């Protein structure tokens, strides 16, 4: 039938072709570089872990996952950061277990 552009609805808005372009280089910040990963893992290897990080690692080792999440959230702050930190600590624990087994 008739499909007139409208100011309301799912497809609201004046129609116009949208041109693709390379994203601005400023959006690239935070992307992990190979050399930076090398440096960060070297520094982690020489330094170690924070006391709260190792306490949370013990909690994950005894497999109290909810306790680990709650403790990390309290110790660090936001739930998103807590989830990311818990995932990285579980990855570290898995790597350590695999190395010990092999």
């Amino acid at each position: 039938a008739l499909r007139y552009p409208m100011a309301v609805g799912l497809n609201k808005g004046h129609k116009v072709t949208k041109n693709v372009s390379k994203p601005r280089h400023s959006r690239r910040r935070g992307r992990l570089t190979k050399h930076t990963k090398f440096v960060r893992d070297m520094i982690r290897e020489v330094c170690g872990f924070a006391p709260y990080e190792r306490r949370a690692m013990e909690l994950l080792k005894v497999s109290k996952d909810k306790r680990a999440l709650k403790f990390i959230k309290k110790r660090v702050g936001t739930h998103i950061r807590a989830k990311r930190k818990r995932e990285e600590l579980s990855s570290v624990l898995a790597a350590m277990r695999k190395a010990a087994a092999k």
């Binding site: 007139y4 552009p5 409208m6 100011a7 609201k12 808005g13 004046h14 129609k15």
Partner: protein, 147 residues
């Protein structure tokens, strides 16, 4: 001008048009809107009902530009275009109808109030009302939406 003011005619009358019993003191009733609920309650209730209290929801970061939506009525609808347009459409025989765009003239919504002259019109707008739509259909014409 100070020439025409009441003060000039008031010189010599001790009192200055403010009474002898009750003088002209500083602030007999309190400053500003004081005593709105205590000793000016009668006046406030008699002349400004609904002054005290709360009602409705709070909208924090209000932006009037989102809600900007000027309106036009059908009696004014033919004034958007020139008279020569309307008369040419009137004495035209091919049945062609002129196109009136209210967004170009700065209106967003068309509301149907007035009587519409009997000739086809292509009204294109952003928002319409049911009565305006039915008026346009009855007079013969088309309603077109734009974004």
């Amino acid at each position: 001008p100070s020439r025409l003011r009441k003060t000039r005619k008031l010189r010599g009358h001790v009192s200055h048009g403010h009474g002898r019993i009750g003088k002209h003191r500083k602030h007999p009733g309190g400053r500003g809107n004081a005593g709105g609920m205590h000793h000016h309650r009668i006046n406030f209730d008699k002349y400004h009902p609904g002054y005290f209290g709360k009602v409705g929801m709070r909208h924090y970061h209000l932006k009037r530009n989102q809600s900007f939506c000027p309106t036009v009525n059908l009696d004014k609808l033919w004034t958007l275009v020139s008279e020569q347009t309307r008369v040419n459409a009137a004495k035209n025989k091919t049945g062609a109808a002129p196109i009136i765009d209210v967004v170009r003239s700065g209106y967003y919504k068309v509301l149907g109030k007035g009587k519409l002259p009997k000739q086809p019109v292509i009204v294109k707008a952003k928002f319409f009302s049911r009565r305006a739509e039915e008026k346009i259909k009855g007079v013969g014409g088309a309603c077109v939406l734009v974004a």
